[PDB]
Design a protein around this ligand. Structure first.
Ligand SMILES: *[C@@H]1O[C@H](CO)[C@@H](O)[C@H](O)[C@H]1NC(C)=O
Lengths: 49, 49
Protein backbone atom coordinates (compact mmCIF):
# COMPACT_ATOMS: atom_id res chain seq x y z
CA UNK A 1 0.00 0.00 0.00
CA UNK A 2 1.44 3.34 -1.12
CA UNK A 3 0.05 6.20 0.98
CA UNK A 4 0.64 9.36 -1.07
CA UNK A 5 0.39 12.44 1.16
CA UNK A 6 -0.68 15.25 -1.15
CA UNK A 7 -0.31 18.48 0.84
CA UNK A 8 -1.06 22.02 -0.35
CA UNK A 9 -2.77 25.25 0.69
CA UNK A 10 -6.18 23.88 1.70
CA UNK A 11 -8.08 22.61 4.76
CA UNK A 12 -6.31 19.33 5.48
CA UNK A 13 -9.20 17.54 7.26
CA UNK A 14 -6.85 14.53 7.57
CA UNK A 15 -5.41 15.23 11.05
CA UNK A 16 -4.23 12.20 12.99
CA UNK A 17 -5.24 11.96 16.63
CA UNK A 18 -4.39 15.03 18.72
CA UNK A 19 -6.34 16.69 21.49
CA UNK A 20 -7.42 20.30 21.64
CA UNK A 21 -6.32 22.84 24.24
CA UNK A 22 -8.20 25.95 25.34
CA UNK A 23 -7.14 29.07 23.47
CA UNK A 24 -5.06 31.70 25.28
CA UNK A 25 -4.65 35.42 24.62
CA UNK A 26 -1.95 38.04 25.20
CA UNK A 27 0.67 35.38 26.01
CA UNK A 28 3.51 34.04 23.87
CA UNK A 29 2.25 30.46 23.54
CA UNK A 30 3.24 27.83 20.99
CA UNK A 31 0.36 27.21 18.59
CA UNK A 32 -0.52 24.36 16.23
CA UNK A 33 -3.61 25.44 14.27
CA UNK A 34 -4.62 22.52 12.05
CA UNK A 35 -1.03 21.78 11.07
CA UNK A 36 0.14 25.42 10.93
CA UNK A 37 2.70 25.51 13.73
CA UNK A 38 4.54 28.44 15.25
CA UNK A 39 5.18 30.66 18.24
CA UNK A 40 3.74 34.02 19.20
CA UNK A 41 0.91 35.87 20.89
CA UNK A 42 -2.69 35.47 19.73
CA UNK A 43 -4.95 38.52 19.58
CA UNK A 44 -8.49 39.07 18.34
CA UNK A 45 -8.08 40.05 14.68
CA UNK A 46 -10.21 42.86 13.28
CA UNK A 47 -9.57 41.96 9.63
CA UNK A 48 -12.58 40.64 7.71
CA UNK A 49 -11.88 37.21 6.26
CA UNK B 1 -20.91 33.49 -22.88
CA UNK B 2 -18.07 30.96 -23.07
CA UNK B 3 -14.37 31.74 -22.79
CA UNK B 4 -11.24 29.65 -22.48
CA UNK B 5 -8.57 29.99 -19.81
CA UNK B 6 -4.86 30.23 -20.59
CA UNK B 7 -1.77 30.06 -18.35
CA UNK B 8 -0.99 33.68 -17.55
CA UNK B 9 0.60 35.80 -14.84
CA UNK B 10 -1.50 38.45 -13.10
CA UNK B 11 -0.85 41.25 -10.63
CA UNK B 12 -3.77 41.47 -8.20
CA UNK B 13 -4.54 44.39 -5.88
CA UNK B 14 -5.96 43.58 -2.44
CA UNK B 15 -7.49 46.53 -0.59
CA UNK B 16 -7.75 46.97 3.17
CA UNK B 17 -11.05 45.06 3.13
CA UNK B 18 -9.31 42.07 1.55
CA UNK B 19 -11.11 42.07 -1.81
CA UNK B 20 -9.42 41.96 -5.22
CA UNK B 21 -10.21 45.46 -6.48
CA UNK B 22 -8.02 45.60 -9.60
CA UNK B 23 -5.84 43.32 -11.70
CA UNK B 24 -3.18 43.60 -14.40
CA UNK B 25 -2.56 41.03 -17.13
CA UNK B 26 1.18 41.19 -17.70
CA UNK B 27 1.28 39.85 -21.27
CA UNK B 28 -1.59 41.98 -22.62
CA UNK B 29 0.48 44.99 -23.73
CA UNK B 30 3.86 46.61 -22.95
CA UNK B 31 2.32 48.94 -20.36
CA UNK B 32 1.06 45.95 -18.39
CA UNK B 33 4.48 44.32 -18.64
CA UNK B 34 6.00 47.50 -17.22
CA UNK B 35 3.44 47.52 -14.41
CA UNK B 36 4.20 43.89 -13.56
CA UNK B 37 7.94 44.60 -13.62
CA UNK B 38 7.60 47.61 -11.31
CA UNK B 39 5.00 45.92 -9.06
CA UNK B 40 2.84 49.04 -9.11
CA UNK B 41 -0.35 49.96 -10.96
CA UNK B 42 1.02 53.49 -11.52
CA UNK B 43 4.09 53.86 -13.74
CA UNK B 44 5.98 57.15 -13.69
CA UNK B 45 7.69 58.78 -16.65
CA UNK B 46 10.80 56.99 -17.82
CA UNK B 47 12.24 54.10 -19.79
CA UNK B 48 11.97 50.62 -18.25
CA UNK B 49 13.60 47.37 -19.35
C1 LIG C 1 -14.19 48.03 4.03
O1 LIG C 1 -13.83 48.45 5.34
C2 LIG C 1 -14.37 49.73 5.71
C3 LIG C 1 -13.80 50.07 7.07
O2 LIG C 1 -14.67 50.94 7.79
C4 LIG C 1 -15.89 49.67 5.69
O3 LIG C 1 -16.42 50.96 5.98
C5 LIG C 1 -16.39 49.20 4.33
O4 LIG C 1 -17.80 49.02 4.37
C6 LIG C 1 -15.71 47.89 3.94
N1 LIG C 1 -16.12 47.48 2.61
C7 LIG C 1 -17.06 46.55 2.38
C8 LIG C 1 -17.35 46.26 0.94
O5 LIG C 1 -17.63 45.97 3.30
Amino acid sequence: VVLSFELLHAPATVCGPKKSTNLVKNKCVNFNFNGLTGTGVLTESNKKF
Amino acid sequence: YVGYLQPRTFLLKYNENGTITDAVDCALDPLSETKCTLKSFTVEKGIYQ
